Design a protein around this ligand. Structure first.
Ligand SMILES: [Cl-]
Lengths: 238, 244
């Protein structure tokens, strides 16, 4: 039997792991799993509901982590310190296709730059890839659409690979890239009405920056009023 | 007393006129008002509910219209034939600032070409949205507004113009004035060209946003492109002064 820690701020992926544990006897016989959300999460209520304790991974002492065979990061909002990843086997469930558009919001960047998008489970380092797979971007899709395919794919990757990774039955491999910063994200959000480009470029920018009800793209008008912008695309008219 | 014919395919305008009649003794004491929708209206059900009969003004005979002092057109989907307008006093309630962007969807065109937008009540002559103007008023286009936002402001203004002027017009107390210029007319084909997006069009983001907001009008999408595989993708935009 192994003890495992999952550090996640993502309701869907945590629920999914929890549901696999409950529906798969192979998990329940082999594992004790503790689940924690990040101390920086501003809205953890639904994770609390789900069955999770707060952890602060930046200040957690290695001394309190000795029982864990490994730690899984599934969209943990805090970066793990170097000392955690060098002293504990840490595996990341990552919503991008390493090594393309590493960093922030891989699907936003892939919409714009056409590099592959997908999901990757890999070892953390200051990492080697156990499994990954690509998803497609279709012409009518926004950031939220692609992210939703990505989450779907992560669940598939978990379901088919995670127990094996935990049991050492799947060995990783160093990536054959590029990285995008939060500041790169924020530069994109600040639209320039005077930008000359193709309608295609400008629709892609709006679609990259459309993600649910929270708008990101904005301009300032003539009067310095802030106006947020999003786009809707559909294969139906109505 | 006078007998009046209102031909309209717009619920909001017909319901407004009905409500003023019901609420203003000056109307009910002077006027008998018949209301009709266009035979071409594919979905008149709400209008039927409202209390209205079908009319085909394109084939209506002039002899059946002798009782009417005047005919009011309020977003009638059929165009009045020349013989009707030249032989009956016909008054149009138009959702544009004549003579600018006469014809179809004035606010779409105004978002694109920046000509004034507003509402106009004018005499109908044999040209579209071209006769002498009784009254009209401008509305503004703000940076976050789509076709439907400006349309709703236009409708609100048509209501105020009717409320403040329509009895006077009927009673020959307000004389109209020539439009300031011939102006410019947009067809349905002009609108449908706009709808077909050219993804290679080279422009400022402002031009592109203006085109998308001109074409955004409620849940029915107008603007489209075809993608790599010839799939048709409709496009609308949302602009707002709040994030969420
Ligand atoms: Cl002239």
């Amino acid at each position: 039997m192994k003890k495992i820690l999952v550090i996640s701020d993502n309701y869907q992926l945590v629920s999914y792991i929890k549901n696999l544990y409950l529906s798969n006897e192979e998990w329940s016989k082999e594992l004790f799993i503790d689940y924690s959300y990040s101390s920086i999460n501003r809205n953890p209520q639904s994770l609390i509901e789900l069955g999770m304790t707060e952890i602060d991974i930046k200040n957690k002492n290695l001394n309190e982590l000795n029982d864990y065979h490994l730690i899984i990061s599934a969209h943990c909002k805090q970066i793990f310190p170097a000392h955690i990843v060098n002293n504990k086997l840490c595996i990341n469930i990552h919503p991008g296709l390493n090594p393309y558009n590493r960093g922030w919001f891989p699907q936003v960047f892939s919409i714009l730059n056409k590099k592959p998008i997908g999901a990757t489970i890999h070892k953390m380092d200051s990492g080697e890839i156990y499994c990954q797979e690509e998803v497609s971007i279709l012409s009518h899709e926004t950031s939220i659409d692609i992210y939703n395919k990505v989450i779907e794919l992560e669940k598939k990757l978990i379901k088919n690979n995670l127990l094996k990774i935990i049991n050492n039955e799947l060995q990783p491999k160093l990536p054959s890239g590029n990285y995008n910063s939060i500041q790169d994200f924020n530069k994109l959000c600040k639209l320039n009405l005077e930008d000359n480009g193709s309608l295609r470029e400008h629709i892609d920018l709006l679609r990259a920056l459309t993600h649910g009800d929270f708008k990101n793209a904005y301009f300032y008008d003539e009067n310095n009023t802030k106006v947020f912008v999003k786009i809707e695309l559909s294969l139906s008219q109505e």
